[PDB]
Amino acid sequence: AIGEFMVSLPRMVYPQPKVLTPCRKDVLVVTPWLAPIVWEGTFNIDILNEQFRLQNTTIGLTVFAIKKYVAFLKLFLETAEKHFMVGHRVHYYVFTDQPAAVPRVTLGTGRQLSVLEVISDFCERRFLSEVDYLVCVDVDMEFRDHVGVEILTPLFGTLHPGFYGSSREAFTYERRPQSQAYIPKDEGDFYYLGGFFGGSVQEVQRLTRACHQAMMVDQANGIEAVWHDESHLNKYLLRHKPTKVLSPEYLWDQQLLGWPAVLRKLRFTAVP
Ligand SMILES: OC[C@H]1O[C@@H](O)[C@H](O)[C@@H](O)[C@H]1O
Ligand SMILES: [Cl-]
Ligand SMILES: [Cl-]
Ligand SMILES: [Hg+2]
Ligand SMILES: [Hg+2]
Ligand SMILES: [Hg+2]
Ligand SMILES: [Hg+2]
Ligand SMILES: [Hg+2]
Secondary structure (H helix, E strand, O other), X not given: OOXXXXXXXXXXXXXXXXXXXXXXXXXOOEOOOOOEEEOOOOOOHHHHHHHHHOOOOEEEEEEEEOHHHHHHHHHHHXXXXXXXXXXXXXXXXXXXXXXXXXXXXXXXXXXXXXXXXXXXXXXXXXXXXXXXXXXXXXOXXXXXXXXXXXXXXXEEEEEOOOOOOOOHHHOOOEOOOOOOOEOOOOOOOOOEOOOEEEEEHHHHHHHHHHHHHHHHHHHHOOOOOOOOHHHHHHHHHHHOOOOEXXXXXXXXXXXXXXXXXXXXXXXXXXXX
16 A cells, blocks of 8 residues: 555664764765655665555556567566566566466465566556566566665656766756657756656656657657657656655666666666
């Protein structure tokens, strides 16, 4: 459940937070609109796990696996079982054009998977009654470390691993005024990834609905955003600030970017 009566936490023993000792001194851990930026070292997962378990939180994880992308499902699901929201209720939603091609992956208790053929006979209304949060990611990836409730919030975006240190002028936002995804050179907070975003079901549906309409307008105007859905997602998150921003630890490509010291963990990565 979400947004309800929250019971008291039990007695817990952990290191006292130090007011005069910054969490991380090498990175920004909070945005100008007071949304935390999630980096390793900023959170005590035991406290967060307690908070979300006491709420009987259910997380939905959605992926689209079309054509040859169905080949990525086995590794994706197997690693998700080892690193994604372990201990919490998880409902995987696999949208594919090849239902019979979905691998039979063994799931831990309290976790289930639904295969939706695709456009589809699945009404978004179902998400509202089955899960509390929705996490939307790409399938040609693998989890390599912890990805848990620390990411849960009404609406979150993830910093693109190739632009987290870039100035806004270098961001590959759609720069044509004729597009609904247009963002001028003097605007923009960060460059978010289209491949990893989420939040409450309500907020995720609001975002996808907004982008769907924006892309339809562009289509009618004979224009296609430079980076398609990702371009519109950036425009949306610029005008509707996310309540949490995930660091590049959450979507990295070690082949193209290595393992910088600023990244204490590589949690979700592209498959070579
Ligand atoms: O500049 C944006 C682009 O960056 C590339 O590295 C990535 O492969 C694309 O999917 C898109 O995100
Ligand atoms: Cl997605
Ligand atoms: Cl998705
Ligand atoms: Hg800290
Ligand atoms: Hg989604
Ligand atoms: Hg949008
Ligand atoms: Hg869209
Ligand atoms: Hg979008």
